[PDB]
Write a protein that binds this DNA or RNA. Sequence first.
DNA 1: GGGG
Length: 269
Amino acid sequence: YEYVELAKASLTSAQPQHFYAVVIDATFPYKTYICSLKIVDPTLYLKQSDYATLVLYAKRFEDLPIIHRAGDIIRVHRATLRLYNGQRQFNANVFYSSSWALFSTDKRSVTQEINNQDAVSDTTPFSFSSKHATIEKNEISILQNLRKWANQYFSSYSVISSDMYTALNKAQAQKGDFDVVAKILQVHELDEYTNELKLKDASGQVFYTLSLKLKFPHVRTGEVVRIRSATYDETSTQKKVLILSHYSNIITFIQSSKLAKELRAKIQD
DNA sequence: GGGG
């Protein structure tokens, strides 16, 4: 097809558009089915962060992307562009015509590095909504360019801007929902289905949250994650606990991430 | 319907 760059898409023509973009933030797929993402590309990011928004609709959880890592790439077809509150908000009905495909930016897909498998052909999506989606050559280039940029971006910028999350030392004064960015100091198996994450962000605070072993199998001790949509447990006593919801999400960062690398270094037990 |  014809893939438009995020800032070049039309807010004028009634026709669907297609594009490749980097995924920097995402909700888990949930039912109201939806998945909301924050995407960026070379023409749209934080420069002298800024980003476009992507909402995906479907009639079943199985037809939505599960983003476990910031930095991977996505490409959607039959997307409609709307302007929702200042940002560029792209919409895609997976149940109708639209489709999506995820491409790993690192050598391995999250799911993959967990299972020690090698990628098919790395022009091959590690997950797609299609009925068994493929790609034409005109693309290889685009996908290879976005990947290179992706690492140049994540490598020199924080990506997850200092104002996209809330320091933990300000968690208790929060009313409602907020995001976090911390280092997992420990993963503990409480039982058959869930773990207990011991978190510590740059503020130096220690928090805990319960994560379902399967919603987030990538969770690992010593790693940095971004937690989308937590809440402070007003009923907490000895421990300070954050509470995840169904749309909540635990996100890791591709290996080039400056933010992730720095926090692994700065934060410790 | 989208920070749900």
